[PDB]
Amino acid sequence: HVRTFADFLVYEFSTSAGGQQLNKCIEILNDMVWKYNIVTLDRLILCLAMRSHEGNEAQVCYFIIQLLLLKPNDFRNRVSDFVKENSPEHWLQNDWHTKHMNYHKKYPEKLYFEGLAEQVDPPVQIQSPYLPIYFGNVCLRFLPVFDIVIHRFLELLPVSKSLETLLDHLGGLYKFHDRPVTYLYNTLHYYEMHLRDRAFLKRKLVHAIIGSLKDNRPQGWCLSDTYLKCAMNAREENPWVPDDTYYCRLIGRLVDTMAGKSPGPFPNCDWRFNEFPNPAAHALHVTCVELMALAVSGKEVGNALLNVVLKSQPLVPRENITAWMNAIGLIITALPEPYWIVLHDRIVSVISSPSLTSETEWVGYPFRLFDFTACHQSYSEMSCSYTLALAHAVWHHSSIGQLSLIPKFLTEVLLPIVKTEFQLLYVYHLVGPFLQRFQQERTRCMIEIGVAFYDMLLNVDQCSTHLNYMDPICDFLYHMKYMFTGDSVKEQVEKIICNLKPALKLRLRFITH
Amino acid sequence: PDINKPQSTHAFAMTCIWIHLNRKAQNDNSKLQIPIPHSLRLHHEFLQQSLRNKSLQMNDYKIALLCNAYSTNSECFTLPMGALVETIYGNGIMRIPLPGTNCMASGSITPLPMNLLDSLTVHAKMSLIHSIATRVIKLAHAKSSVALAPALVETYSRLLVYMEIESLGIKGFISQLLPTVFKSHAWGILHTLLEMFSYRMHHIQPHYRVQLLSHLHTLAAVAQTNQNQLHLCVESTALRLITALGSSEVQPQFTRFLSDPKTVLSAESEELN
Amino acid sequence: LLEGTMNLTGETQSLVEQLTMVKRMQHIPTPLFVLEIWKACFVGLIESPEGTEELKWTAFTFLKIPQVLVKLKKYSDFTEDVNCAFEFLLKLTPLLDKADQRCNCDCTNFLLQECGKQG
């Protein structure tokens, strides 16, 4: 019923002339919703916001919501009193019932068309007994609708200023929100495309949510000091671009929280009544929220996060770097796609290094050149070891959805670049360990990786005179055949096998069967 | 030591341990009698004289001391247990007026705080939960129009947090108390349970959540949910639960209910789905 | 590292004869020998704590080992082996960077000039 009326109202407002008519219409709408209490405000606004209009009708309905919220003084004189006489912490106090009585007697609530009953000229009285109400009011019933209408407003482009004024006037409602941080995280991660260009709106949103609850919670619970000091101020066409020390501080807070410290960078809380079961989860969510809300594009942020460990950087001591790898992987996997997509370009850059193609001074094992545990002694050769370690760490903490993007990259980009055997060994070391996960969850990816490996071997064999490490390669191929792929990749293998050099053909007879 | 410190309860714990073992000496007393240790008798002297006195209240923690000492007794536990019960229940003390028309509740408004609630043992906890459940189901079967005491519903909310009691807690409650209260056809106790669900928990396991949502759709559809308050409550809880689902848990949760999708979604309201 | 730790005041003849004896005992190519010597010297320098021990280690690794290399030349083709060992050593960027940032100067340039002085 209410949705059809909501559609009628927006259609009427799409045909209503602007001026005094609009003001009187919004006033009489306020009167129906509250002066007679025909319908609770939350249901009516949810019905208005659950429309699928196209063109200017969406703007008309959005503007009608805006006029119904902020123009009306009566709605405001309730949320301010509620947020001034109540606090989110309920388990720590014993005098809540009388405060509820005071608030409810200040503003009576009618749910059985009471106000509509009194206004009738004949005397109409309601005699249906109520039911026990211990926690209910209009503000808490309206709060989820407020969140959903914030989402609807972000879906459309020219209604940014309405969002700004709505937040600036009703930021106090979120003092009682049960899970505000996760709401921010999901909202910012879901609308990244629509918010990469509007940095001011994103800054306003995050600032309002954090400053809503800046009094009850202890100091430094969500945001860092440097961000609350520099970037908190209004922009002046010179957005605060950070140096590497800021990123180093963020990663250090996460590894200190996860490792376990008695003082702790984050003050302790009662996890029984919070939304985050563990300190580690809370730290991960707040770090992701703070890093994702910057005005810098994703590529530079991701590149800086990677360069925290790649480049020679103090404040990161040795014999502890695996924890830093862990923190980087956990943070970068939760960020949206434009941030973590830079690792492919990093691998492409390192595979084209001169030390892999021409400078092959090291005639010994390349097997120990790629073992990062050799960092125990001072053998961190080049970025090859560090990039290999980060690729392993990032792909370990990633889901199958992120890993499914690997075979296309392997068969499209790296295929026409690998010429020598060291690059082939590098890609083998890079891809090998995750065949288990691939076979568990997606067999098509397994087929693609097998055929890509065979094609790469053929290209290297055609373009290279000889292979000094053919025995490990043959052993690895036999292991892959007898463990993971079984006998599924058969038809596409004989054509590649038949064209190889006679020694490889002699040592790969059993592959075809 | 001093009683006001909760840690001193831990100090008395070993003494209570001995008491429990002597209670196991109640039956088969002729086999394996173990005498009192030397240093414990001075401590043991205090508790019995405390038991003999008839001035016990939450000002100190001696009420919790008695509960921990005698939880395994059928005659010594009944006095402290009741002594908590009428205080958190208001057994006919007064009729405080709830907001709206025809809403009468008991005069008790002060529940047990966290320090006192966490100063008890698991057995006393489950005994209290069972007693509260028995009287609330008794009120539901008696068709009482009197609203329950606010202090006891706050205590009810504060006793479901503990994770160790899921055998007796949320599973048993959702499985038994809710269908029985629904079948009693009261809709006052039902409304109190629904509003407690809405604004008084944070950690509920996903299968309990989906079962509760299916219960709401069952109760929401039939049983004449035409009264404005009932549908508002049901409407509010249907949107509060749906909008709070975890991102990575919905996929393993809904794959269990694939055969009958009608139990997890509504028909009358398009807003929910 | 053992020779540089304790008996820094000993005669270099014993060190030279021990190094040649070890080289003969297990077949070691010359570039690997020189690269291992330089890497051992640098890693011993880096781990030295602040104080007179750092000064002693710097003096050892920048003064004494050129005479060891000169005596190896005299007892023993060696020039290109030294160049090859140096180009191996130059690949290790993080070790050189840590050693450089510890001593607040480009120690590689000073080492190259010192070895060039010896010819």
Curated annotation (Swiss-Prot), chain B:
Superkingdom per UniProt: Eukaryota
UniProt-annotated location(s): Nucleus
Outcome when changing residue 200 to Q: In MRT18; specifically impairs the response of JUN and FOS immediate early genes to serum mitogens by altering the interaction between enhancer-bound transcription factors TCF7L2 and ELK1 and the Mediator complex
Function according to Swiss-Prot or TrEMBL: Required for transcriptional activation subsequent to the assembly of the pre-initiation complex. Component of the Mediator complex, a coactivator involved in the regulated transcription of nearly all RNA polymerase II-dependent genes. Mediator functions as a bridge to convey information from gene-specific regulatory proteins to the basal RNA polymerase II transcription machinery.
Family membership noted in the UniProt record: Belongs to the Mediator complex subunit 23 family.
Subunit structure: Interacts with ELK1. Component of the Mediator complex, which is composed of MED1, MED4, MED6, MED7, MED8, MED9, MED10, MED11, MED12, MED13, MED13L, MED14, MED15, MED16, MED17, MED18, MED19, MED20, MED21, MED22, MED23, MED24, MED25, MED26, MED27, MED29, MED30, MED31, CCNC, CDK8 and CDC2L6/CDK11. The MED12, MED13, CCNC and CDK8 subunits form a distinct module termed the CDK8 module. Mediator containing the CDK8 module is less active than Mediator lacking this module in supporting transcriptional activation.
Disease: Intellectual developmental disorder, autosomal recessive 18, with or without epilepsy: A disorder characterized by significantly below average general intellectual functioning associated with impairments in adaptive behavior and manifested during the developmental period.
Entry protein name: Mediator of RNA polymerase II transcription subunit 23
Annotated source species: Homo sapiens
Record gene name: MED23
Residues of the full protein shown: 412 to 684 of 1368
From Swiss-Prot, chain C:
Ranges spanned by the short sequence motif LXXLL motif 2, renumbered to the chain: 92-96
Protein name (record): Mediator of RNA polymerase II transcription subunit 24
Expression (tissue specificity): Ubiquitous. Abundant in skeletal muscle, heart and placenta.
Subunit structure: Component of the Mediator complex, which is composed of MED1, MED4, MED6, MED7, MED8, MED9, MED10, MED11, MED12, MED13, MED13L, MED14, MED15, MED16, MED17, MED18, MED19, MED20, MED21, MED22, MED23, MED24, MED25, MED26, MED27, MED29, MED30, MED31, CCNC, CDK8 and CDC2L6/CDK11. The MED12, MED13, CCNC and CDK8 subunits form a distinct module termed the CDK8 module. Mediator containing the CDK8 module is less active than Mediator lacking this module in supporting transcriptional activation.
Family: Belongs to the Mediator complex subunit 24 family.
Gene: MED24
The protein's role, per its UniProt record: Component of the Mediator complex, a coactivator involved in the regulated transcription of nearly all RNA polymerase II-dependent genes. Mediator functions as a bridge to convey information from gene-specific regulatory proteins to the basal RNA polymerase II transcription machinery. Mediator is recruited to promoters by direct interactions with regulatory proteins and serves as a scaffold for the assembly of a functional preinitiation complex with RNA polymerase II and the general transcription factors.
Superkingdom classification of source: Eukaryota
Subcellular location: Nucleus
Residues of the full protein shown: 249 to 371 of 989
